Design a protein around this nucleic acid. Sequence first.
DNA 1: CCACATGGCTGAA
DNA 2: GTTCAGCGCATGTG
Length: 374
Amino acid sequence: KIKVIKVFEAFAGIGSQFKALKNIARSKNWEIQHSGMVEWFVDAIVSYVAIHSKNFNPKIERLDRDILSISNDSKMPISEYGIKKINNTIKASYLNYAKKHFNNLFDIKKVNKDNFPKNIDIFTYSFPCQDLSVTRSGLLWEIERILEEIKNSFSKEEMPKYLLMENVKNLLSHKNKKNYNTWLKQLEKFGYKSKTYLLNSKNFDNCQNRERVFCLSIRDDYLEKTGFKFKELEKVKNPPKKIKDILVDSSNYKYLNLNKYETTTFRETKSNIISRPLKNYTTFNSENYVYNINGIGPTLTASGANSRIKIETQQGVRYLTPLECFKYMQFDVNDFKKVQSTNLISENKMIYIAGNSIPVKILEAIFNTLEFVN
DNA sequence: CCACATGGCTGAA
DNA sequence: GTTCAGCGCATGTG
Ligand SMILES: C[S@@+](CC[C@H](N)C(=O)[O-])C[C@H]1O[C@@H](n2cnc3c(N)ncnc32)[C@H](O)[C@@H]1O
């Protein structure tokens, strides 16, 4: 009676999609399987392998000769020299393992109907808002190409049963809304019916304000077969959680010297964020706030002001640590310790990958609504 | 027009 | 090439 769920994670990062599925699998009587992934960012791949692998033992290895399109910064491709630098290191073994055991295809432009797995149960993806226009472009154009290709070569039953997009709130702005709607029409042409959700992490057992757009799609014949109905997730409001609830005790944190800066009382906004400004601190508004641990915090970003989240504690004002950032995205302590134990990812890079991820319990809630046939 | 609220990019080293 | 401290406005609601 156990149902094997084959998942394919495009732009997988550290695998918040896979983590969410593993977290609910037992309660669904599911067995989650890596059908494939696409991730080219070296530090995300290393971290993905650290978190999700079972019995992987790193060692010095030659990099597989076809692992050629990867990135050290996540934005730009690594040079022929940078590839040489990874070759014959422990780090290479992580990339080789992702290829061999998780079927990482690395670069979306290299994905086609010849290597895209058949009978995928859940296909997850994303794209930047610029991709909506020149007709699509960039990563979304590649997703569209792949869907076109598999549509023509696969039977309908071999095409992914469910698609899930995550994106930022700007996807529904005045400038992007219409073009996003045209993408949904295209998914329709491909045989998928979809539902757009705007969800805030704070409503899914988290102490973080984080509004994300999700487009859950179901293949239209599978909809008929299962009798699946979309759930109204935008009305869900679980009990609030405070920053206080995830903080880790330590006698050796670094506290910021803010003695030079004038401040005010804390004020709570409608979003349950409780903050106070620092005057003459910077000219960058988002950098100038200290947050109260009895409320929720701001959206964790990969870089910049919202990756340096100042909280007021009894011991002083400090940044949320990398561990606390993992917990803030609803990964567990053990996930963080596995990444830390690689000794390959710096503290700022760990925050960077956390800031790019998705709060895990939002995904648990979405995935809890899926229906599969026996 | 106003007040209020909220979330990456890049050049110097 | 890497790294991150320094830096502001885009996109809203009311
Ligand atoms: C915002 S993230 C998503 C992270 C993911 N949701 C998670 O669970 O951590 C988007 C990811 O897509 C990756 N990416 C960008 N261009 C890519 C390409 N051509 N091929 C593969 N991955 C790419 C980036 O490295 C980045 O980690």
